[PDB]
RNA sequence: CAUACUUAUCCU
RNA sequence: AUACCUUUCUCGGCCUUUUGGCUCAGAUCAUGUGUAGUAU
């Protein structure tokens with residue numbers, strides 16, 4: 001890679017201006033998708049090799065509901081996941097999270113990322129079960145990835161919980177803020 | 180493996196030792212609006228005059244008239260809003276004191292005097308705000 | 313210009329540190345990864361993508377798609393430089409004789425393992 | 433190789449920046465470290481007082497869903513970042529954050 | 537005689 | 549005719565400097581006829 005009088009050898013990255021760069025990105029990302037999902041949640045989300053199931057659909061509802069990860073997409077390097085948790089599943093998760101990041105003072109909520117772009121009632125609240133389910137699923141999915149390849153960063157991420165005390169499910173996908 | 184969260188240098192604590200205090204000051208404690216040399220301000224609360232004024236009586240004359248109950252009357256003056264209280268007190272002041280060039284300054288500046296309306300914020304609303312004896 | 317220089321100092325150094333501090337992917341992270349991929353691809357009854365065959369039915373349609381794509385950068389183009397003119401020349405050649413373009417492409421994929429300098 | 437040396441009717445051209453302004457000096461009053469006020473005190477008392485106050489009152493003392501998943505606990509072991517000054521143009525943290533922010 | 541250079545001169 | 553000193557010639561050798569400082573290596577780098585004049 002040369003700029004003017006600068007030059008170096010690319011040994012590590014991918015050259016993104018390659019024409020087949022997209023194919024490498026999408027296959028490598030597929031590998032990271034299998035890391036996030038496991039070869040069972042992936043093979044259920046994908047459907048059989050003979051009868052694959054369409055983008056966000058499943059063959060059954062027994063297959064659909066077996067696992068927290070309900071809906072999944074990756075748009076090249078950006079992942080959108082929707083889980084639905086039991087309160088038993090959510091509770092186990094928040095436990096393991098806090099027992100892993102113990103903070104007695106309740107400094108959990110301070111650096112949380114939920115967008116101010118929406119009105120103040122309608123954004124995700126500051127409940128402890130909800131802030132903590134957010135951070136706990138972020139932390140549990142971020143543990144799924146070897147940090148030599150990638151991580152998730154909380155500052156370039158966004159979790160939204162829909163719970164008892166939160167009526168809306170939020171995301172932003174491509175330039176669209178959706179509530 | 181040591182990532183490209185690589186460390187290139189020791190800390191200022193390894194560099195300087197335990198007994199050197201190491202400070203990183205990346206933002207100011209105060210804004211530009213806090214002077215570094217605080218101006219010694221006239222604290223403009225309610226600005227009165229710097230010496231007992233000239234009256235048509237003395238100091239000891241009032242000192243006399245105080246020491247015997249039969250020549251002292253205590254009176255509060257009340258009325259509606261604006262109905263003339265401050266101005267009547269002011270007319271009393273005007274007849275029993277020495278403040279004529281004050282009056283000249285008043286009718287030159289274009290305002291009528293308010294003696295008991297002293298606080299220059301009770302003044303600029305043409306309103307008595309707190310009673311004054 | 314200053315930020316491309318600054319980025320390229322950082323990036324030259326990242327490329328150096330990789331060669332010093334070695335592959336970041338651990339030998340038994342890479343093997344868990346490779347194995348997950350193997351078991352996935354085998355679960356999917358996947359067949360490898362073969363080298364573009366010689367008598368490949370789609371070979372010329374794919375090349376024409378390629379060349380359309382490469383030409384498309386030159387359909388508004390008003391003034392070209394020697395690498396853009398050279399590109400348009402080679403696109404024209406590969407439109408004119410698709411079969412020798414295809415043979416060059418397959419010889420490249422088969423043999424070529426060292427490539428020219430990329431400008432950034 | 434060699435700078436211009438700047439040695440010194442009068443010309444009647446009047447600059448705009450040379451018109452009267454700030455035409456009286458402020459002097460230090462009683463309360464702004466005036467010289468007669470500062471002989472009166474022991475500045476070493478106040479310095480050692482403030483330093484002791486700072487140095488003490490900074491010290492403060494007188495199976496589950498994730499069973500197919502191949503990697504576990506991958507954030508644990510990550511370094512938490514620190515408020516530090518590196519005197520390096522390109523290897524400090526402001527710069528690494530800057531290049532992270534602006535180059536995509 | 538054939539390559540090149542050109543000039544507010546001349547066209548396309 | 550030789551030994552001394554002494555004097556002459558021939559080889560071997562040498563530093564700043566002439567460095568137009570800076571920036572987005574400052575930037576770009578290359579798509580004609582026809583005549584005539586000249587170089588070939």
Ligand SMILES: Nc1nc2c(ncn2[C@@H]2O[C@H](COP(=O)(O)OP(=O)(O)OP(=O)(O)O)[C@@H](O)[C@H]2O)c(=O)[nH]1
Pocket residue numbers: 258259260261262263264265266267305306307308
């Ligand atoms: N026409 C007329 N106006 C008067 C007279 N005395 C006072 N005023 C006016 O009435 C206004 C209000 O009277 P103030 O002196 O404020 O007396 P006040 O009723 O105590 O008013 P507050 O201070 O609001 O309680 C004054 O500003 C004068 O302009 C008077 O005898 N005749």
